[PDB]
Enzyme design. Structure first.
Site, PDB file in Angstrom:
ATOM      1  CG  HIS A 258     -43.587 -88.604 -29.778  1.00  0.00           C
ATOM      2  ND1 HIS A 258     -43.783 -89.876 -30.270  1.00  0.00           N
ATOM      3  CD2 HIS A 258     -43.055 -87.887 -30.796  1.00  0.00           C
ATOM      4  CE1 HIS A 258     -43.362 -89.933 -31.521  1.00  0.00           C
ATOM      5  NE2 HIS A 258     -42.917 -88.738 -31.865  1.00  0.00           N
TER       6      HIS A 258
ATOM      7  N   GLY B 145     -43.366 -96.133 -36.184  1.00  0.00           N
ATOM      8  CA  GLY B 145     -41.999 -96.366 -35.771  1.00  0.00           C
ATOM      9  C   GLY B 145     -40.951 -95.601 -36.551  1.00  0.00           C
TER      10      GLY B 145
ATOM     11  CB  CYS C  49     -41.103 -91.021 -34.623  1.00  0.00           C
ATOM     12  SG  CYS C  49     -42.780 -90.544 -35.080  1.00  0.00           S
TER      13      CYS C  49
HETATM   14  C1  LIG Z   1     -43.828 -91.929 -35.358  1.00  0.00           C
HETATM   15  N1  LIG Z   1     -43.444 -93.060 -34.956  1.00  0.00           N
HETATM   16  C2  LIG Z   1     -45.245 -91.696 -35.825  1.00  0.00           C
HETATM   17  C3  LIG Z   1     -45.256 -91.557 -37.366  1.00  0.00           C
HETATM   18  C4  LIG Z   1     -46.617 -91.409 -37.930  1.00  0.00           C
HETATM   19  C5  LIG Z   1     -47.410 -92.691 -37.732  1.00  0.00           C
HETATM   20  C6  LIG Z   1     -48.101 -92.900 -38.899  1.00  0.00           C
HETATM   21  N2  LIG Z   1     -47.381 -92.096 -40.056  1.00  0.00           N
HETATM   22  C7  LIG Z   1     -46.518 -91.218 -39.511  1.00  0.00           C
HETATM   23  O1  LIG Z   1     -45.817 -90.454 -40.085  1.00  0.00           O
HETATM   24  N3  LIG Z   1     -45.729 -90.440 -35.230  1.00  0.00           N
HETATM   25  C8  LIG Z   1     -46.828 -90.404 -34.256  1.00  0.00           C
HETATM   26  O2  LIG Z   1     -47.369 -91.399 -33.911  1.00  0.00           O
HETATM   27  C9  LIG Z   1     -47.263 -89.038 -33.688  1.00  0.00           C
HETATM   28  C10 LIG Z   1     -47.086 -89.001 -32.169  1.00  0.00           C
HETATM   29  C11 LIG Z   1     -47.407 -87.572 -31.602  1.00  0.00           C
HETATM   30  C12 LIG Z   1     -47.605 -87.614 -30.085  1.00  0.00           C
HETATM   31  C13 LIG Z   1     -46.284 -86.571 -31.971  1.00  0.00           C
HETATM   32  N4  LIG Z   1     -48.648 -88.708 -34.004  1.00  0.00           N
HETATM   33  C14 LIG Z   1     -49.140 -88.721 -35.418  1.00  0.00           C
HETATM   34  O3  LIG Z   1     -48.399 -89.000 -36.313  1.00  0.00           O
HETATM   35  C15 LIG Z   1     -50.588 -88.346 -35.731  1.00  0.00           C
HETATM   36  C16 LIG Z   1     -51.123 -87.183 -35.185  1.00  0.00           C
HETATM   37  C17 LIG Z   1     -52.449 -86.817 -35.474  1.00  0.00           C
HETATM   38  C18 LIG Z   1     -53.229 -87.623 -36.303  1.00  0.00           C
HETATM   39  C19 LIG Z   1     -54.708 -87.209 -36.644  1.00  0.00           C
HETATM   40  C20 LIG Z   1     -55.173 -87.410 -37.941  1.00  0.00           C
HETATM   41  C21 LIG Z   1     -56.479 -87.048 -38.291  1.00  0.00           C
HETATM   42  C22 LIG Z   1     -57.321 -86.474 -37.334  1.00  0.00           C
HETATM   43  O4  LIG Z   1     -58.652 -86.105 -37.702  1.00  0.00           O
HETATM   44  C23 LIG Z   1     -59.553 -86.060 -36.621  1.00  0.00           C
HETATM   45  C24 LIG Z   1     -56.857 -86.261 -36.037  1.00  0.00           C
HETATM   46  C25 LIG Z   1     -55.545 -86.628 -35.686  1.00  0.00           C
HETATM   47  C26 LIG Z   1     -52.682 -88.791 -36.862  1.00  0.00           C
HETATM   48  C27 LIG Z   1     -51.370 -89.154 -36.578  1.00  0.00           C
HETATM   49  F1  LIG Z   1     -50.839 -90.306 -37.121  1.00  0.00           F
END
Ligand SMILES: *C(=N)[C@H](C[C@@H]1CCNC1=O)NC(=O)[C@H](CC(C)C)NC(=O)c1ccc(-c2ccc(OC)cc2)cc1F
Ligand SMILES: *C(=N)[C@H](C[C@@H]1CCNC1=O)NC(=O)[C@H](CC(C)C)NC(=O)c1ccc(-c2ccc(OC)cc2)cc1F
Lengths: 300, 300
Positions: free
Chosen positions: B40, B142, B144
């Site tokens: 991603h 960040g 990830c």
């Molecule tokens: C990596 N850089 C980052 C780490 C996250 C950011 C905040 N804390 C972490 O561990 N990862 C991401 O941004 C992910 C990208 C996807 C495309 C793999 N996404 C998420 O971490 C993510 C997904 C879903 C939600 C969420 C929470 C609650 C909800 O209720 C309706 C719906 C969706 C949040 C989220 F940070």
């Protein structure tokens, strides 16, 4: 989430060596052309009861000290005793000496410990200097010479060298100048630390971290005063809070919108009514091993 | 004492790089002439809701991927997508590639996480793969691409790459082949993990560590059977104990002289009567993030 984080130990691993004197082996810290290790490496099991470290050191020469840097031996061309640390001058400067400094930390400050055995790194964990100048670490036999450190940017801040374990199970040691933290001495006698108190400013920083991370049930609404809070803090063996500690928690209080005295009143309620089975950041107790610096570092 | 210990992170620090694609920057793992990072990285804030990672990757070429190894850039001469991980072929092999292997760990196993931001190590802590295939870590934006690993002797065992955070605050990720742990997918949708259960065999190993370290108040005298204990374990959301788990705790039971079923009955009493304000190894809860291997490694 919120976790107990240690600094990356890469820069410190390259400084750990094995120091052998007679039939005693412990870890040493190899910085530039100097090796630092606890002076009781020259002690036998007999002398450890009441050692005369002078009389013991006089009977040793340079070639009595064996220094192992992995598989390569370092040649000892000079030795000296500074307080409770022994300084071995070697002919080869450590090619992986990082930018470093020696600091003496204050009670309540935290640092990372790299537990070592026979000069080999075994693990890393985060510790805090208790107000009674002990630490609640994890140390086996041969762990002496393991170092505690903080990492700012590129610089390594060596602040602790492990020396001994107390009857209560906690641990005592020195700074890198050989000066012990607290009133402890390096001999096998029953030494007592004072009554261990809780680092109040660290608990407040942890409650602020709980607020930043969505855990907010403990937040009452009462407020209090610094003198009134401290009256309750003394009764629960808590460190007294000063206006310096209040200003230190400033940025955390500005980020969460909760005044320091408001958080003090919520802690007050937690001290007299307990957890009632509810956890805070996954803990059923009040954690005091997070400084305000550690909280903002992890939360940003 | 007894502490949560992470592995020394030195061998892993030298493998962390910065990977930039468009206006997204995360961490990558540089092993030999290959860089591994979450796929991603090619997503914009728009696409993250429902990305077609194919259609997104087709529109990218080698020169769209920026790889930072500190201050030096690595030249990307090939890219490919394996499950949820992106593999970038670079022209330079990492001169600090350690002896490594890729493993897929099981629920209940522990590992060390090196939290990184912009390809720079920030801290290290010890984690456990929950039975619902999540982890309770500490990750900001960040983070990830940060990796989880185990260290046996010289070999590094990479087992986890961080990908996302769930609504409950826990974290999900993949192995180094891009296969997610659990039923999670890499898109911004509300994904639910199952009810998180407690790793029963890990709690027993921790109770054994408490016995080795002098904390022995919880030891009742009743015994029980595997079927009878499991009947109580189900009621408290505890993982069922098998004869494999019993044999795993064998050496710990032989060192302390306490039969596994005896320790099972003491845990039973703790589950139905609670702590009553008494701590075990300094904790008012039952810790399940210590494997039997971790206990014997630390206690010896
Ligand atoms: C990596 N850089 C980052 C780490 C996250 C950011 C905040 N804390 C972490 O561990 N990862 C991401 O941004 C992910 C990208 C996807 C495309 C793999 N996404 C998420 O971490 C993510 C997904 C879903 C939600 C969420 C929470 C609650 C909800 O209720 C309706 C719906 C969706 C949040 C989220 F940070
Ligand atoms: C270093 N290799 C070793 C680490 C210790 C060993 C066990 N756990 C640790 O952290 N340190 C030492 O062996 C010390 C050497 C002295 C000469 C500096 N000594 C001790 O750690 C030590 C001192 C005193 C006691 C003790 C305990 C109870 C008691 O009640 C009567 C009296 C003395 C124990 C002890 F391990």
């Amino acid at each position: 989430g919120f976790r107990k984080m240690a600094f990356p130990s890469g820069k410190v691993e390259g400084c750990m060596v094995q120091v052998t004197c007679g039939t005693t082996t412990l870890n040493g810290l190899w910085l530039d052309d100097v090796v630092y290790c606890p002076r009781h490496v020259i002690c036998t099991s007999e002398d450890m009861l009441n050692p005369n470290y002078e009389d013991l050191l006089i009977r040793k020469s340079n070639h009595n000290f064996l220094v192992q840097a992995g598989n390569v031996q370092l040649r000892v061309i000079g030795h000296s005793m500074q307080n409770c640390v022994l300084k071995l001058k070697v002919d080869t400067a450590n090619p992986k000496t990082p930018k470093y400094k020696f600091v003496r930390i204050q009670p309540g400050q935290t640092f990372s410990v790299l537990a070592c055995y026979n000069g080999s790194p075994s693990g890393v964990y985060q510790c805090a200097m208790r107000p009674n100048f002990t630490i609640k670490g994890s140390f086996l036999n041969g762990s002496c010479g393991s170092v505690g450190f903080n990492i700012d940017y590129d610089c390594v801040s060596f602040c602790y060298m492990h020396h001994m374990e107390l009857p209560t199970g906690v641990h005592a040691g020195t700074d890198l100048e050989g000066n012990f933290y607290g009133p402890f001495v390096d001999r096998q006698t029953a030494q007592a630390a004072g009554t261990d108190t809780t680092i109040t400013v660290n608990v407040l920083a942890w409650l602020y971290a709980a607020v930043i991370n969505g855990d907010r049930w403990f937040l009452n609404r009462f407020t209090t005063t610094l003198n009134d809070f401290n009256l309750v803090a003394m009764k629960y063996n808590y460190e007294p809070l000063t206006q310096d500690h209040v200003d230190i928690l400033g940025p955390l209080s500005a980020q969460t919108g909760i005044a320091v005295l408001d958080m003090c009143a919520s802690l007050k309620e937690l001290l007299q009514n307990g957890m009632n089975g509810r956890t805070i950041l996954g803990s059923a107790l009040l954690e005091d091993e997070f400084t305000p610096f550690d909280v903002v570092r992890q939360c940003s």
